[PDB]
Every structure is written in structure tokens, then in C-alpha cells.
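Hi W.,

Here's what went into the run:
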Amino acid sequence: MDTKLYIDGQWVNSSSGKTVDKYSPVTGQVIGRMEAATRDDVDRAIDAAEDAFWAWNDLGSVERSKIIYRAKELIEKNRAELENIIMEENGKPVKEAKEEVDGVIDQIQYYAEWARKLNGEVVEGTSSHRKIFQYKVPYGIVVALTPWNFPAGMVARKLAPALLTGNTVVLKPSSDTPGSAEWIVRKFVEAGVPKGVLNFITGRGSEIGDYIVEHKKVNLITMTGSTATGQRIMQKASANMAKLILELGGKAPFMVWKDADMDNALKTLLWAKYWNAGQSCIAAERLYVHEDIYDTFMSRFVELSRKLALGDPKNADMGPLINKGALQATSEIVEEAKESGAKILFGGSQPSLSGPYRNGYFFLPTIIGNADQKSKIFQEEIFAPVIGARKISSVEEMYDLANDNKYGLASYLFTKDPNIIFEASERIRFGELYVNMPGPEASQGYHTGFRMTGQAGEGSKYGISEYLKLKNIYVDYSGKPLHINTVRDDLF
Amino acid sequence: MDTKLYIDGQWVNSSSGKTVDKYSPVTGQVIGRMEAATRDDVDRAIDAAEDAFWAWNDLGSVERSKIIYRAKELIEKNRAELENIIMEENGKPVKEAKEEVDGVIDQIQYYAEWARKLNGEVVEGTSSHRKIFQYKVPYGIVVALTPWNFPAGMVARKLAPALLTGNTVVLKPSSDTPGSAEWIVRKFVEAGVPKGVLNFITGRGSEIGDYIVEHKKVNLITMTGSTATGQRIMQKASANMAKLILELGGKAPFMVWKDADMDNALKTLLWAKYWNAGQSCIAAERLYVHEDIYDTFMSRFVELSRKLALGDPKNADMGPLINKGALQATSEIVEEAKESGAKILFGGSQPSLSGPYRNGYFFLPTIIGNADQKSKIFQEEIFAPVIGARKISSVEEMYDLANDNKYGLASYLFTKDPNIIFEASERIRFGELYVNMPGPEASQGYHTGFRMTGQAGEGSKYGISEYLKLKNIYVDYSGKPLHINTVRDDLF
Amino acid sequence: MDTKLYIDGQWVNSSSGKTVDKYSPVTGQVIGRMEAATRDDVDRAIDAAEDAFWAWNDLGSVERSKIIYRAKELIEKNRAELENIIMEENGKPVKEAKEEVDGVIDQIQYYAEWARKLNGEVVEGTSSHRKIFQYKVPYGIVVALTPWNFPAGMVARKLAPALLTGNTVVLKPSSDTPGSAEWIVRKFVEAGVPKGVLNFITGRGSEIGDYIVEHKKVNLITMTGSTATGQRIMQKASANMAKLILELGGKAPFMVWKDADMDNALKTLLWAKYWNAGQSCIAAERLYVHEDIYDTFMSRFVELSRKLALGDPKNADMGPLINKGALQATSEIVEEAKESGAKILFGGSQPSLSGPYRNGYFFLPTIIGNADQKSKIFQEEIFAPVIGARKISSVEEMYDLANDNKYGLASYLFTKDPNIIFEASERIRFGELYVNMPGPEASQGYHTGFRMTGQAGEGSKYGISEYLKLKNIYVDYSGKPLHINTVRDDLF
Amino acid sequence: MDTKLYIDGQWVNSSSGKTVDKYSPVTGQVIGRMEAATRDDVDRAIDAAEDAFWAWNDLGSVERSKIIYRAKELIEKNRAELENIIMEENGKPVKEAKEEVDGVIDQIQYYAEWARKLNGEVVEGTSSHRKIFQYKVPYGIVVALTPWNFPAGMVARKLAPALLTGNTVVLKPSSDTPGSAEWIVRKFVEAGVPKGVLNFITGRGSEIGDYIVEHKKVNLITMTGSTATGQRIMQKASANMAKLILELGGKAPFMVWKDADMDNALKTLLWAKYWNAGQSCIAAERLYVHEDIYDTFMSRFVELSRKLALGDPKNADMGPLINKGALQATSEIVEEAKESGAKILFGGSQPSLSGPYRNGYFFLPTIIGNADQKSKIFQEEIFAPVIGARKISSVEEMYDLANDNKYGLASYLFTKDPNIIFEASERIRFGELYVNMPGPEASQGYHTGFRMTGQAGEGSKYGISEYLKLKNIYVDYSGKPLHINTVRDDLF
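Here's what came out:
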């Protein structure tokens, strides 16, 4: 697939004529190219979104919702193509590709359904002939930056609320996954999104990354990705004071209390560690199991993990890592854990596969025993199918170990003790706490976290409300002479 | 007066006992000294607030509200001491001082009244035996950074909601106004704020500024002040992803349509330009008057501006600029305008005062006619008693000129046309729009702006909610085996 | 057409097969028959809705929303059948019929969009280890009682939110308009509403009216219709304390101030008096015109009213009254007015039509001049194309006269004075105030009134929330012995 | 104590000169008289509240809150007198009297704190130059009817929200408890409540009960009491369509699961059955205990109940019933249970006390074994210190037995099973579910119930919001010619 740019209502090439290659993570070979937009291409996109703003705003949320619902319907009718792009670009197992598309459709529906419901407010003024009207309006130009890990889902997550609320958009996806973003944009265009409202830019971070976030006309940046990139964004966006929506790294603790339903804890851990090969912002990244059940728990976890099939999307339980860098990083991580005296209970290397799969970026499920709380494998995001395990014996200890983390997104808890449940609901300082169940997040939740996890959040009434700016109108309708305490009336 | 630090429940000196002087804006003589905190002092205050956190949180908003009400009561009873400190430190006219204390009292009441009212939410889960609980909890450690212009009002604005919602606080006021902040802090301490909950730090921006906003343990920064400082903060807080509440510059358009109540608009303009010597984040900074009335209006505004008295707080209409750096900078602004050919209709220099006041940092009302829309005096914030006026002739032009502005806080509109009032409520892209009345803002409004004016807002339900983080708890209580579409049940 | 009952998943006859006739308001000839439910039939429908309840509740709002959307889609596709039934049953002009179906579609969409958005709340408990969860759950069995005036629109208004929020329903429409209701019911059944969830009952008010509203198992009654019936309902529902949603009479004041846009006010008045022959709960029922313009306004309103055509739905401006009882009652109203000395400026009788239409229940536009504020025609609802006008001369008088009214639904105001618009927003004690525009109400408004107009409201977040009951769960998770101040611990 | 009436700003006698005697429930002797207001007295009170309304409204919620806070402070400063009136009029133990006053103070604070926070809403209109403004305003005249059981608490509950929200009030307390109501009214008057805003009427139900609720000018009735009285009120209020807030009977099930913490379950049951001698709308009125622990549970409950002291407020654990009728009713209830073959495990009669206590209305704690689910003691409210116990063996059974009740207010649940907790939160169809803790309700909860328990509710944002009416203002500010689909433009 050769993907293109979409700027001010037309599909176009990069104005340098330059491109970037797309590699299959399943086979390791080139399967596609995308355009490498220049800064002038970016300026044109941003100017187009500026010019389209007032008419997009004036249409109203209901009319905007009709277009967004239309896009959902076209996506749904032709979902197989999108599922296939995800399998090709990411190597996801077919059921993950299908589930992610299910999420694309669910999100678009959910966000468009907010039409004419995100109300402003009327407040008492400082007299009986004064009121304060509080309107919720769009921020203006939204830059939407989506990561490679959920390359369809994350596009729906950002475009649908930005658009429903009356902002115009310039979307730049990950260069590892341009295809799924392009396809979704195309469907929005087919749905009737007007000229300049939705723009699509691909290119190298090193050429256009700072430029698109620091640009004088940007009003809001909505981004999911790496912590380091979110930090740079926040630095650069000081040039425009853009409203920021950053969802960054996670290091979810997975906590299994002595009274946990073992089977459910273990099903959920297989999901939480190995879904999308651990390439999830809510992946189980630390395992804490009560000492009374630690040995039986770990034995069964290793035995189940042994039964996972890697390989082709058509039949694998688990797919490859996104690119050669992710693979080299993951090996380096495991080798550092080894050189620290961590014990590898299973995995820890790339397997030797045959056929075209020999050159994909496959990594084995990897379980690490008696992992130090202060080690790199406990303190730094891994984003791959590797986890360390540690024993716990008390509730206060469990809370303290979990919160001793620079990340604060998801977390998991298995127990039948209602008091641990309710207490942890406040004591576990994480944006999401999953209790006796797996993720992923729901559209009605507010996907967010504490500490290095970022800024603002996505989903729920509050997430869609992050794309609205509250403004105040103070009116005086007394029809009488003003009296201002610090201004002498004898001047009049 | 001499001010000290307050750290972990005790008044203490700077770790090294270094101090900074304080000058009277009314006489230019040294009148006070403050402690120069060190980086170590900031650490101790932040560590103190970390330790106090859980017990403060655990106290509940009701019990915390009792302490805050007590502080209000002690403030109200001893208010004359605070009025006097504002007059000495800032040189404000007695009625401005009194008014700022009225607002201290009003704000502390308003915010404490939120006890037990900032609810979380319950949302439907993905099955009948699932729910998503959404708790609002405190961010943790709040760094409060207050400006010199409303040095009592701004301290109340930040402490009251930060404390009510269960955060601990380190407060660093402007080195131009340490006294009013210390006095309020001391009132909260007398009201029984527990050790560690509220810390007070003074010192030089150049020595401890970056340090305090970049610190590892800071969860939230709430700051009002200059745009350039807010930009630096946003850059530095990329080190901790602290939630940002930034209230930065304004360049308020003051718009008088042809059918305006002339007397009321002129009253309101005298207030909006000359209150606190124009040193207000909502000061009139551009004057747009309808061509039919421009001449009469400018004429009257000049004559009125001539009648305002500058000098002693006990009898002036208008006080002095905060410091010699403000004075230099205001003269330079006026000189740039005069040398771009701008027409000075009145004033434009320091008045001619006798006695001690000739050494104070006074500046006359300065009115410029037929200003250029793209000039410095229309595009850059002045924060001084200077304004240029331009003719307007259409409603669309009025909106466009207002909006052609890197700032986006307050704005003023005088008209008796309902369709302009309603349309402008959306077309004027400013945080606040005062229609047929002056400011200042009410506690129930969401004080905020668009564009360079900053991040988030203060006041109203929404402003106090900025000090709360929303977290989700997903619970499954089916009590049945889990089924996860991507995890094979034949493994169990 | 012949209509049947729908009970527990099957179309069925009356237990005894008794029927009621239906007359064309356009020709006065019998055109249809409906089943006469018996008390036993009502029991079976209520029992059915009781049984279906838990599984309907358990389905979740998302899944229920899918059924409701499907019903909308089937309605939209087959809309011409519903347009034709409204024209036959009610005699509405083709553009009124089409418009009422547009509103059916709009409402079903708007309400289904609330899926997963009507959140519960979490509130702070009386200790750090306590919370109060507040769930919104359905009331249970909803009895929906719809009037004949908007016989499609009103059915959509009540079913859509009742079903979305997880209630089961028994619907009993007006015996004057069974067809439009049955057709919509059949669309929900085709959309897959599960057995028992939606039941359809027709029959005589005198036989089953009290029975259905007093029934032991009814949890909620939602009714629009005449005041006297709503009074009877409120009395009868004292037997079950059912939650009441009652939308009863209106007596809307139509107020034209001296500076009104004359053309727009006259347009709006033609709509507000003569839309649906004045058979609207928001029809203009009193006309108050400023003394400066009264003569010109009345003169123009008369000439315009003369030009409106009465007759066939295919080409009339105005249709007939619903039944012969409406016609008798309108003549009596006009005769009472003529015999109290009221001055008839136009009309006041049945028109002179040819052919089948001479047997239809037509009534001319009727305009009375210089009406008395305390007269029947100003104090009692007419629900027919009749209105009297009075001069007004002050703003306080306008408010007072508007408010001197046992009803409190809609009102209309035409003026270009902002201070009147803002002040009237509070001074006019009516549920709806239309300023410089006509109705009807929008789905996002809270359709409601003061005084005799009834109980609760419909539309907006608040209206759909009326079908949800809030319950509290208080939880203590301290895990420590309890201490209760009035219970001695020395007993333990 | 001779209590008087307060009508239009003056303390007065009944205009018939008639009175009603007040009896001590401790001694059985006359200790007081109250005025027996006539209908004309009622008309005067209601007219006074009508006349005071606009000025009370215009004051604003903040100014109204100052008066209400002032009343709280005067109550708090002189609380001993109120505690003493409660002990005298009701016979409550001193700690109950003190706790109820604590509740009076807590409620008044909580409600007044809603000043300027119960916001209206701004909603999108049907074009870009249309909005819908939604204001929350007072209903008007509130009739407040308070019961004898919490004769101070229930007055604070009703007056504080009614008044804060800008309604005027006519209060009629129970004739068994005029003293505590009068005292609270007096304190509101001392706080500065203006003339006609707060009116105080006492008299016989049979003379003025129907009259005050059916009166033409009443806008809202807020009542707590008996189910039969609430039913009559709802019937009579059909005359004015008053907004209704009725809290009526309860029959709380008290459920103790096999894994319950016995000590806490038993402390809570002593409270729930014997607080205020069972004269509570949330009293334990049915006991369900899991068969595995039934016999040990009942043994300990009987042994603890044996240890409760009846008698004088100064030292009793439990006080007398309110009057001779309550005593005769309670005996009749026990004798009917006996004649049905219920087994009385303890109590069931009035004790033979000495001194003045011999003529008080004392009744022993009464526990009844193997009580039939369909008996009067399980199906009808008792409101006295009598309870029956029944075994359970499953969760579905427990839910079904609990919901098989015509009441639906409070309920109690002791268990350590988190799944029963979460599931019951939806399955237990009661307004309040107390889990591992006692009542009473908190000011931030929404005290309400299902089925016969009444209408609307009190407390929380939603309870105070029941005293506000939401109104809509639809504005069109296009400034263009209207086009109405069903009105021909060629008429213009």
C-alpha cells in the first residue's frame, strides 16, 4: 500500500517527493511506502484547518454527528479491509484485529452520541439583574498524533470527539502504521467531511515533529505514545499554549491476593501480558502474587504461557513486535535483567521460525522470577511480552510497591476481600484499577493516569469535554446607572 | 515587615539565612525583608507536604472545610492588618485594598462551601455484573505561585480550593509581595492547618524557580503571572508531568458600539484601564469605539482621565506601579509608541508629585488616538495605565479585530443590541466577556482564557475540580468464569 | 384501519372482542376500529412488563439503544405510511404530518443517544473508609398515556426514554388516535423489542382509565393530556405512589413589545395560533400587544388570518378539530365570549366548505379585540383557533398579566430590548419562553410548566432522567469494630 | 411551654382562641399547649409568603445563605435549650437529643453551602443563531409538614433547602412536637429572615390538614410522615398540582449473611431496631439471618436487648413511645402477632415502672421468632421497638424476600462477600442500602425510596434541586426573516 497526504480537500504527494518505507513485522520485508510530508505541507494542512473552522463550528454538533455516524456506517460495512490492513501492518492475530475494529466502531458511535448534550451553564451574577453564562465551544485547530500499537483504535479515539465538538483536525499517525489511519480518513471524507476539516499528514518525526506541535496556529494537541515524545511535546507546545491531552507510558502492577480466584486471575494475566504482544499502554508490567499462592500461581502461568502460539495472524495467539528497534530494545532489556542476576523462568529470546516468518520481529513470552522492586524491569516500561514476578505478604506493602512507580496508568487486582477492593480504590494511585477482570478500557471510562502518564484523559463525558473550552459571559441588564466602588460618581 | 519561611509546622529561617529586600512602590525606600529559601528549603517543604498528604486526605473535605472557615473568620476579624500590608507593599488606594480583602473572604467562603459536593461518578460497565466507579481524588502536592498584582486575592484563590480538595501545598509568592501572603499563611496556621499541609517559601526566581516546578514530587502547579514565566514552567514541568493551571497575560479589547450607554461605558473604562494602575490580567488593553461616537467618547475619556488623582493610598484614585522595572518598561512602551508616530492625546509620562512620592513608581494615564491594529501597543501586554483607541464600523470587523490577538482572557462590550450580545457570546473568542458592566470576575465564574493566556482555569465548579484527578475502578462481580475473546478457554 | 392489542409478545384481540369506532375529523365518517381492552387485558400487559423487567434491565442501555435505533431506521424507511395515518386520523395538513414524523425520528435518535451517559454518583461518606454510591436505575413498569393532538410525536416522546433507561412499558393511546400509536409499536416489535417489554392497550377511559393508573404494580405514569384527567390520575396514583410525569394544559401569552419585528411576530403568531388548528399545548392562547402598535398589528393579523385555507390535508393551511365534542365545545366558548360583549374582529364559526368536508369538524380563525383579562377566553384553555388580544403599556404590567394564569407552559416574546429579554427570562413564570421565534420545543429542552401544567417534564438530560430512580448504597470498609455513639461499647 | 403562631412577621394567637394540649411521653402529664390555628390563620400565612416571595427571590442565594448560616450559629450557640425541648417533648435519651441537634446544625450548614452552585444550563438550539437557556428558579410557596419522630432534624431538613433556593415557607409541625419547631423558627427570625418569608402554623389535622395542602396558592409540599397522610396529600394536591416531596413509611429488611462480622451486625441491629425506640423511617423492621448463624445470632441479640435500659432521658438507652395512641397500636400489633402463633422471644408489653414514669408510654424491646413472611409484622410498618426474625439460605431468596414489601426506604446488609455487595446494590430495590454499617442518612445522600415510600427525595444535590423548577428560554438572534415550514411566506 502506498499511502498519500490529504491536505485541504485533496489527496496529494509530499512536496519534496520523498517517502518512507513500511516493513511487515511478520515477514521483515518492505510492503508499502508513505509520503514524507515537508513543513510547507504541514503549514498547508494547518492553514486549511484554520480556514474551515468557522463553517465547521457553525454547522452545529447535530449536523456534525450525522457525518460522523455516516463514517461509522461505511467503516462497519467495509470492516474486513481495515482488519486486513491491521493484520498486515502490525501482524496482529485476526481476533485482535477484529476486536480493535469493533472498538473503532464503538468509539465513533459513543462520541457522536454526545451531540447537543455537552451543555454549558448558567450561574448567578452579583446582583438580581446580572447573570454569568458559561458556553462550551471548540478549541480550534487540533493536532492529533496517534501511536503504532492500536493504529485504528487510536485514530477513532481522537478524531471522533475532536470533530463532534466542532474542532478541525490535522492527523499525523505513526510512520510504522500509516495504512490504517489513511483508510479511516478516507471513510470520513466519503462520509462528507467538508474541505479543510480533516487533514492527513505522514512524515518523519525528525523533520516535522517539533514543527507541527510548536506551530503558531495550533490550539490543542491530542497524543498517545512514548513518554519521552510527550515530554518534548509539552516543551515545544509552550510556544502556543496548546491545550494538552497526552497519554504516555504505563507500568501496570498486576496484584493477586491470597484469596484470588486463580483461574480468572490467570486468564486475565495471559490477556494482560500477551495481548498485542505486550504492546499496550495497560499491559501487565509487574506481577505481585501473595506468598501463600506464589509458587502454584507461577507454575501455572509458565505452563499456560508455554501453550501460546506465535506466528501468522490467521492462527497465532500472539504476534510479532512492530519493528527491528522494538526487537533490539526487548533483547537488550532481557540481557540487562540477566546481567543483574534475574532468573528467567521461560522465554527471553527470539525464536528461530521458518519460511518468511524467520525474518519477522517475533519474541517469546518471557517470565522473570524474584525480580528486584528497584530493577529496570520493575521501574522502566517494557512494551513487550516480558514480565517479572515478586512475592507480597500484606495489603500496605502491596499498595506501597504498586505506587512506587513513575507511571500511573492501569493496574490489576484479584481478591475476594471487599475491604481491599474499596480501600485500594483510593489507595492504588492509578488512573485505572481493574478488579477481578481484564481490560481493555471502555468508551465511557476516563482513560488517564497519574505521574508520568501525561495530561488530561480520553473517554467518558470528561474526555470528550477536554476538546471544549469553557467561556464566560457576564451580563448586566439592570438598565440603571452603574456604581463602581473605586470610581468617583462625582466625575459624572 | 520581616517575613520568614514556614516549613513542616514551624516558622524557620532560610537554610543559610540569606534575605531579599522589599521596596515601597510609593516612596522607593526599603521597608521590608524576606528569607531567600534554598534548594534544600524547597526540598524540606515538598517532603513535608508529601508526608502530610495521607492524613490530610483522610481527614475528609468536611473537616478540612472547618479549618478553612476558621481561617476566613480569623481573616475577617483582623482584616485591617491585611488591608494595611497591601497598601504598604503595593501602594493601592484604600478602596482597592479593602475590596481585595473582601475578595479574599468571599473566595475562601465560596471554595470551602464545596465540601462533600464535588462528586465522583458511576458508569455502566460492559455487562450487567460490571460497573465503572469514577472517584475524584486529590493530585497530591500542589505548588502555588502567586503574582504581585493581587497579592492577597491570588493566595486565597489558590490555597482555598487546593486545600479543600485534599491536596497539600507549597506556596511561593512574588518577591515583590511576601507580606500579604505570609499574613494569610499565618492565619491558616492559627486556624489549625496540620503540620506539613501548608508550607510557605520565598526566594529569588533565578535561584529556586526552575527547581520548584521541575521537582520529582510535585503533582500540580497553579500559577498566575507573566506569559514568559508560564512558558518556562510548562517546559520545566515536562520533568514531572504535573497538572498545570496557568493564568498568564491578557490583552482585553474594550468595545463600545454606537448604541452604548455612554456614561456606563466611560465609568467602566475608567475602572478597566486605571484600577490597580492597569496592573490587572483583565485591564482594558485596546479600545475599539464605533465611528459615530468615537470623537465624543475619546474627548470625554480624556477629560475624565485628567481628573484622576495619583499618590498616597489614603486619597488617590490611582496608585503607583509595583517596582522600578515596571516603570522603566512602561516608559519604553510609551517611547516606542511615540516613535512609531502614535498620537498622544493625554499624558504619557510620570506625574509631577511632591515629597516622598516623587521617588515612587507613578505613571500618568496615557491615551493614544487612532492606534494601529498591528502595533506593539495593540499586540503586546502593557500592564500599566496606557491604552490606544481605534474606530470600528461593523460587527464582523469588531469580532475579527478582537480575535486578532495572541491573548484571550477578558473583553468588554457596551451595546443595547441583543443580537450582537448573543452572537458575540460565541464570536468573541475570549475567556471572559463583560457585557454592559465592569469586572472583576466572580468566584462562580471560570476565570480562564484562550491562546497564550495559559492552561485550565480558576473559579466555579470547574476551577475547583482542576485540583481533583478522576480515576476509574472497573469491577466484575459476576462471580463466574471469565471469557476473553482473544484467550482460548480450552487452555482451562 | 383496524387496530389490535399487543400483549406479552403477541398481537391479540380484546379478552371479549369488544371494539370502539374511529371517525375522520375531515369527513365525519367511520374509518377504523380498535380493540376495547378489559381490566383483565390490562393485568396481562402489566404482568408481562413485570416479568420482562429484569432481563430488559440486564440487557444494558447500549443493547437496548440498538433496538431503539433499529426502530428509528424502520420508521424512517417507511415514514410515508405514518404520515398518511396522521393525515387520515387527525386531518393535519401534509406539512404538519411530515413535520410530526420528522420529530418522531429526531426524538427516538436523541433519546437512544443517552446510552451509557446518565451516570450515577459517588459521594464522600462520614469517614475515610466510607462511601455513598448513588445508582440511577429504572423505576420498573411505566404506563404511557398519550393524547390525540400529536399522536405520533407523543408516543416517541414517552417510549424512547422509558425503554432506553430500562423500564418496561404499557402504552395506551387516545381512543381518537390508535393507528399512529399501533404503527409505531409495530415498528419497535419489528426492531426486536423482547416479549413483555412493550405492551399496547386501547380502550375507553371510562372503563379502564382509573384501573390502569391505580394498579398495584405500576411504578411510573407518563401522561400528556387534559388538566382534569391529570388531576384524576394524581388522585388515583395515590394508591401506588407512582412517579408522575404529567403534561397538562397551557394558556400561552403571546407578547409583542413596541420594538418587535412586526413581520416576524406576525409569522410566528400565525404558526402559534393556527398550527394543528390551535390544538397544541403551546398554542398562543392570549395576545398582548404594545399600545403603540396594537392597531396596525391586529389589522394585519386579521388580514393574514383571512387568507388561511381550511380543508383537505393535501392543500389546506389548517386542518379540522379532532372530533364533534371539540367542535361543540369551541362553538360554546365563542358563544360565551359573544354574550359577555366581546368584540369579534374575524370569524367565529364553522367555515363554509363543499362536499365531504361540510361534515368535518372545521372551525374558522377567530380573533377577538380588546379582551378582558379575567374572562373565560383569557383564563380557560381553548385548544382551538380562537384568541383575544389586549393592549399593554409597561413591562411590569406585561409580566403580571402573563403570570396571572393558572397555567404555565409556553409563552412568546417579541422585542429588540435586551434588558426585557434577560429580565423576562426570570420574571415570566413559564416553562418555556420563545424569544423572537416560534416553537415547537426541541428534544434538548425540558418541556415542562409551572402551576396547573403538571408534574416533572420531558426532554433534555433532565426529562430522560425522570425515568430513573436514584438509590444510595452506604458502605463501610474500615474492617474495624463499629462505634455508634448511642450504643454502649461495654455491652461488647 | 405554650407555643404560638408566626404569621406575616408577628407572633400571634389562633384567631379562634383555641389550643391543643401537649403531653409528656415520659410522665403522661400535660406539659404544654399550642395554638390551634384556623383556616383564616392559614390563609393569612400563605398570603404573607406570597407577598414576600419576589423580594426573597431577588435577594439572591448568597444573601439568603448569610441569614441561614446566621441561624445555624444561633442554634449552635444555644443548642442545650433545643436538646432539652427534645428530651421533654419526645422523651429521647440525652445522646439522641444531642445527636439530632448535631444533625440540625450539619444540615443547615450543608444546604446553605449550595449558594450560587445549583447552576442552570446552556444548550444548542436548532440553528447556529439560536440557544436554549435553562434557568433553575424557586417554585414559590412551600408548605413544609414535619413529623414528630425527629422534630428538630426534620424542620432543619425542609426549611434550609426551601429557603436557600428562594422559596417562601409555611411550616406546620406535628401537634405532638410544636416546641422544637417553634424554637428553630424563632432562631431563623432572630437571624434576620424577612417578614412573610417563614410562617409557623400549628393546629389539628382535622381542621386545617386538607385546607393547607389543597390551597390555591401553594406551589410545593414537602412532607414526612405516615403513608396514609401522604396518600391524602397527593389526592388533595391535585387541586393545585403542587410539586410533591413525600417521605412516607418504611419497612427496612435487616439482612445478615453467613459470613457477617457478628459483633458489628449486632451493634448495628441494636441501633437500627432501638434508636428512638424504633420510631424511625429507617428502623430495622424485619430480620433475616442466614440459617448457619441464626440461633447464635438470635441468642446474642436477645441477650443484648435484655441489657437495654428504658426510662429517663438522663440515663436510659431507650425512651418511650410518643403518645397513648402509639402505645395502644403497638400492643394491638403484638397481640395480633401472638394470635397468629408467632413466638415472642422477649418483651411484648409495657413494663410497670414507678414514680412519674408509671404513666409514660414505655414499651419493652420485643423480639419475635419464626415470623411468617406474609404476616402483619412483616408486611405493615410497626414504628416501635418490635421485630420478627426469619431464616434464609440463599442470596436470590434474600433479595426476593426483601423486595416483597410495599415499602422501599432503607435496608441493611452484613456480609464479607464482595459479589453479594455489588449485586445487591442493584438487586435490593430500596432507596438506601446500608452495608456493614448503621444509619442514619447523611446530608449528601438522597433520602428516598421505591414503592409506597413516596415522591422525590431529600438531601444531596438532587434533594435540594427538588425545590428548584427548571425553565427554558429559546432565543433567536439571527436578525433575519423567519421561515416557518407550515406558514406560506407568500402571505408576506
